[PDB]
Amino acid sequence: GPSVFLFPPKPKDTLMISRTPEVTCVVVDVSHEDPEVKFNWYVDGVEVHNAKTKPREEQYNSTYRVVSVLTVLHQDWLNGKEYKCKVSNKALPAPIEKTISKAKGQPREPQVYTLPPSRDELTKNQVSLTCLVKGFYPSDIAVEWESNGQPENNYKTTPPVLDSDGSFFLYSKLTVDKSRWQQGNVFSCSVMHEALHNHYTQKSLSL
Amino acid sequence: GPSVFLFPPKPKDTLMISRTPEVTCVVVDVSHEDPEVKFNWYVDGVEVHNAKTKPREEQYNSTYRVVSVLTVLHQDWLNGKEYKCKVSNKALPAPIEKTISKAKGQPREPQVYTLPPSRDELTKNQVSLTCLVKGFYPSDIAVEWESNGQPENNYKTTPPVLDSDGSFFLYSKLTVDKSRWQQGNVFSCSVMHEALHNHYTQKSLSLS
Ligand SMILES: *[C@@H]1O[C@H](CO[C@H]2O[C@@H](C)[C@@H](O)[C@@H](O)[C@@H]2O)[C@@H](O[C@@H]2O[C@H](CO)[C@@H](O[C@@H]3O[C@H](CO[C@H]4O[C@H](CO)[C@@H](O)[C@H](O)[C@@H]4O[C@@H]4O[C@H](CO)[C@@H](O[C@@H]5O[C@H](CO)[C@H](O)[C@H](O)[C@H]5O)[C@H](O)[C@H]4NC(C)=O)[C@@H](O)[C@H](O[C@H]4O[C@H](CO)[C@@H](O)[C@H](O)[C@@H]4O[C@@H]4O[C@H](CO)[C@@H](O[C@@H]5O[C@H](CO)[C@H](O)[C@H](O)[C@H]5O)[C@H](O)[C@H]4NC(C)=O)[C@@H]3O)[C@H](O)[C@H]2NC(C)=O)[C@H](O)[C@H]1NC(C)=O
Ligand SMILES: *[C@@H]1O[C@H](CO[C@H]2O[C@@H](C)[C@@H](O)[C@@H](O)[C@@H]2O)[C@@H](O[C@@H]2O[C@H](CO)[C@@H](O[C@@H]3O[C@H](CO[C@H]4O[C@H](CO)[C@@H](O)[C@H](O)[C@@H]4O[C@@H]4O[C@H](CO)[C@@H](O[C@@H]5O[C@H](CO)[C@H](O)[C@H](O)[C@H]5O)[C@H](O)[C@H]4NC(C)=O)[C@@H](O)[C@H](O[C@H]4O[C@H](CO)[C@@H](O)[C@H](O)[C@@H]4O[C@@H]4O[C@H](CO)[C@@H](O)[C@H](O)[C@H]4NC(C)=O)[C@@H]3O)[C@H](O)[C@H]2NC(C)=O)[C@H](O)[C@H]1NC(C)=O
């Protein structure tokens, strides 16, 4: 019967001592006939006992959805430990095991480049300030914009794209009124990633 | 029983009259017990009979895969016609139908901007040339880089991203030997989209 899907923590959660990163083991197609779901968890094959199973939930195709959440240590995740969720159930001929970790391999530091609007774009009422972030690994990253000790929120960031050397790049675009740019205001692209000192860097971009 | 997947044509194929846009209806998990598959195709709910359906082909997991390809008119696709593939097979309770069509909304012309390398990147052996393409709708688009009439190949383009105004943008990044940039070679970002004049525009980039 059942199917298991196992999900990683969010990039920022693994990078900030403040946040709590979780791995989540989701089970679907739990039948009303066989509702008792058991989870065992292992960190590098070592069984651990701190996961938290949430109460079951009725789905609308007559099956239950049962979730187990395991909180992980930042340094454990970042050092590449493997988290295995093993799901046991009367409906199965064998337990179902899923394993997840941070993407494997040597982390690489983002290079961050800010690019002013094109002269062609300066004919519009709003312009694009571009932040190119390239050469990073793994793809988990978070990008933001600020100006004058203030956060700018009118930006959108592409997903990471796999580049030809196996690292990733993305672009983040901040849209601003042209006049804010022409006055010489300074804007900055902020990036958080494993491979940066203090997990953090910024580059400025002004006229 | 069987499953059906219905795929659109490629955006450059719908935009250039020299290419042939096709909609592809694929059926998989066809059993030995019920091997016969029939396709009916509809365009805006009107049956058509001009599809090219291929003989079933047995897969290494001993199921059949059967494909039907309907060639579409370039202007039919861009005019938003709806293409429906209906698949009958004895193992099914009812035929399976899928429908596909261009995204709905008004078309918007892409704005294309080329941006040179950052000075900070001039310490590297390779440099990044950037093409920003923004303000476009629908998201179907094709982008490439050329120099001296020869197509570049060492570039990568982001997927289109929904912008705050409901249009899309993307960026394409071309990587080049820094010395080709230094020499003053000209590079061009070329863009094809339905809301451009003649479905095509090109913007050039070079040093100074
Ligand atoms: C019944 O019912 C149910 C339910 O229902 C529901 O639904 C809907 C529709 C409606 O109906 C309503 O009613 C409701 O709501 C069902 O269930 C279902 O199921 C299915 C299955 O079948 C599933 O699916 C899946 O999914 C996935 C995903 O999912 C996700 O997402 C979605 C959307 O998007 C959603 O929905 C969900 O929910 C999810 O979400 C998530 O969650 C999580 C958890 O919680 C989270 O996380 C978290 O968070 C938090 C906060 O919040 C924190 O942060 C923490 O830390 C964390 O953890 C998140 O966030 C979220 N997200 C979002 C976005 O939201 C997908 O994934 C999958 O897919 C897969 O599978 C399939 C098959 O099956 C396929 O097709 C696909 O493709 C895939 O596959 C895969 O692939 C991949 C690739 O890519 C792979 O890997 C790989 O490999 C390869 C080759 O080898 C390569 O190499 C690469 O590289 C690698 O990586 C893999 O392997 C594979 N896998 C497999 C298995 O195969 C699926 O799809 C769903 O989910 C469900 N739902 C739910 C809700 O759950 C059922 O089914 C029914 N029944 C019947 C009978 O029908
Ligand atoms: C037995 O073997 C079968 C054959 O498999 C072979 O391969 C081996 C590895 C091995 O398995 C062999 O035994 C065997 O030889 C196997 O068939 C497979 O079944 C799967 C289903 O179980 C199919 O999975 C789907 O794949 C879709 C994407 O398929 C494309 O991409 C993959 C590679 O990524 C490729 O392998 C496929 O061939 C297909 O390629 C596309 O092909 C089209 C058609 O030709 C091309 O378009 C044409 O291109 C030409 C020029 O080439 C021209 O331009 C034409 O104009 C143009 O139309 C594309 O270019 C080409 N693309 C690429 C990238 O190559 C998935 O999209 C699909 O996902 C959807 O459904 C899932 C449910 O199953 C769901 O989880 C998923 O989220 C998604 O759901 C959709 O979600 C969307 C979100 O918006 C919704 O919008 C949709 O509505 C929704 N869909 C639905 C149905 O609701 C799915 O994963 C797989 O294609 C198929 N393989 C083949 C080769 O057909 C079979 O399973 C085996 N059986 C058993 C029991 O093992």
Best mutation target among B108, B111, B118, B130 (most A Cβ atoms within 10 Å) is B118
CA A15, CA A106: separation in Å to the nearest integer? Answer: 16
Secondary structure element (H or E) that encloses residue A179, with its range: helix A178-182
Dig out the tokens for B73 from the structure: 């008119």
Contact of A128 with A120, CB cutoff 8 Å: no
Residue A33 backbone phi and psi in degrees, to 5: -60, -45
DSSP state at residue A155: E
Nearest residue to B14 via CA among B189, B156, B142: B142
The reply to whether CATH 3.30.413.10 applies to domain B2-101 is no
Strand order across the A201-205 sheet: A151-152, A142-147, A187-192, A201-205
∠ at Cα B67 (B61, B73), nearest 5°?
155
Is residue A171 within 8 angstroms of chain B, CB to CB? Answer: yes
How far apart (Å, rounded) are the C-alpha atoms in residues A106 and A92? 38
- For residue A46, count CB atoms less than 10 angstroms from its CB and return exposed for 0-12, middle for 13-18, buried for 19 or more: exposed
How far apart CA B3 and CA B133 sit, in angstroms, is 37
Q: Number of residue pairs across A and B with CB atoms under 8 Å?
A: 74
Do B111 and A132 make contact, defined as CB atoms within 8 angstroms?
Answer: no
Q: Which letter does DSSP use for residue A108 in this model?
A: B
From CA A168, how far away is CA A155, in angstroms rounded?
20
Residues in chain B: 208
B28 touches ligand 2 (CB under 6 Å): yes
Alpha carbons B102 and B34: distance in angstroms, whole number: 34
In angstroms, the CA B35 to CA B32 distance is 5
Here the tokens at position B56 are: 């079933």
What class is the B102-207 domain? mainly beta
CA nearest to A118, candidates B201, B167, B132: B132
- Please state the φ and ψ torsions of residue A89, each to the nearest 5 degrees: -170, 145
Q: Respond yes or no on whether the N-terminal peptide bond of residue B138 is cis (omega within 30° of 0).
A: yes
Q: Whole-angstrom distance between the N-terminal and C-terminal Cα of chain A? A: 61
Contacts of A187 (CB under 8 A, 6+ apart): A114, A129, A145, A146, A147, A152, A174, A176, A204, A205, A206
**Pairing status of strand B96-100 against strand B83-88:** antiparallel
List the one residue out of A190, A183, A179, A187 whose CA is nearest residue A147. A187
Instruction: Count the neighbouring beta carbons within 10 Å of the beta carbon of residue B24.
Output: 15
Instruction: Tell me if B63 CB under 6 Å of ligand 2.
Output: yes
Tell me how far apart the alpha carbons of residues A156 and A144 are, in angstroms, rounded to a whole number. Answer: 9
Residues of A within 8 A of B171 (CB-CB) are 130, 158, 171, 173
Q: Which is nearest to A70 in space by CA: A58, A81, A84?
A: A84
Q: Domain residue spans in chain A?
A: 2-101, 102-207
How far is the C-alpha of B58 from the C-alpha of A79, rounded, in Å? 45
Please check whether residue A2 is in contact with residue A37, taking contact to mean a CB–CB distance below 8 angstroms. yes
Q: Give the burial class of B42: count Cβ atoms within 10 A of its Cβ; 0-12 exposed, 13-18 middle, 19 or more buried.
A: middle
User: What string of DSSP letters covers B143-190?
Assistant: EEEEETTEEP--EEEPPPEE-TTS-EEEEEEEEEEHHHHHTT--EEEE
Total Cβ atoms within 10 A of residue B207 = 12
CA distances from B39 to B3, B81, B168 (A): 13, 19, 35
- Three-state DSSP at A114 gives strand
Q: Is B178 in the pocket of ligand 2 (CB under 6 A)?
A: no
Shortest CA distance to A167 belongs to which of A113, A115, A109, A102? A109
Nearest to A127 by CA among A175, A73, A159, A188: A175
End-to-end CA, chain B: 63
Residues sharing a CB contact under 8 Å with residue B7, sequence separation 6 or more, in sequence order: B23, B24, B26, B100
User: Residue B199: left if φ>0, alpha if ψ -120 to 50, beta else—which one?
Assistant: left
Same CATH topology for A2-101 and A102-207: the answer is yes
Which sign, positive or negative, has the C-alpha torsion A188, B165, A161, A69? positive
Give φ, ψ of B181 to 5 degrees.
-70, -50
What secondary structure does DSSP assign to A11-63, as a single string? Answer: HHHHH-TTS--EEEEEEEEEESSS---EEEEEETTEEE---EEPPPEE-TTSE
Answer whether B152 touches A (CB < 8 Å): no
Q: Of all atoms in ligand 1, which is nearest to the CA of residue A24? A: 58
> Any idea which ligand is nearest the CA of A103?
1
CB contact under 8 A, A134 and B173: yes
Please write down the HEC assignment for all residues of B71-136.
Answer: ECCHHHHHCCCCEEEEEECCCCCCCEEEEECCCCCCCECCEEEEECCCHHHHHCCEEEEEEEEEEE
Question: Which residues partner with A48 through β-bridges?
Answer: A41
Q: What is the DSSP letter of A78?
A: H
CA-to-CA distance for B114 and A43, rounded, in angstroms? 48
Give the C-alpha distances (Å, rounded to integers) separating B98 from A11, B6, B29: 37, 7, 16
Give the other-Cβ count within 10 Å of A28's Cβ: 16
What's the resolution in A?
1.9
